């Protein structure tokens with residue numbers, strides 16, 4: 312059960328992480344547009 | 345070895361998200377040249 | 378104990394990866410200014 316809990320918690324964190332940084336990049340694009 | 349293998353599969357996953365984000369940053373960078 | 382260790386190693390890499398990308402993004406923000 313726990314290893315399956317782990318797999319779930321990681322894919323999710325990785326998704327937020329990816330998006331958290333992509334936003335920093337999106338603001339830069341809008342700015343220097 | 346089963347959990348170790350799991351570590352390597354997730355590690356492979358982060359290096360890819362890392363590189364995938366860097367490319368979006370490299371695109372803008374290439375434009376800013 | 379092997380699951381706990383795998384978490385530590387995964388959280389560390391995710392933490393580093395994030396900042397290593399933000400540091401690259403900051404270099405680009407400097408090229409713009």
Ligand SMILES: [Cl-]
Pocket residue numbers: none
């Ligand atoms: Cl650090």
Ligand SMILES: [Cl-]
Pocket residue numbers: none
């Ligand atoms: Cl640091």
Ligand SMILES: [Cl-]
Pocket residue numbers: 396397
């Ligand atoms: Cl660092």
Ligand SMILES: [Cl-]
Pocket residue numbers: 396
């Ligand atoms: Cl820093």
Ligand code: NI
Pocket residue numbers: none
């Ligand atoms: Ni530090």
Ligand code: NI
Pocket residue numbers: 396400
């Ligand atoms: Ni830093």
Ligand code: NI
Pocket residue numbers: none
């Ligand atoms: Ni550092």
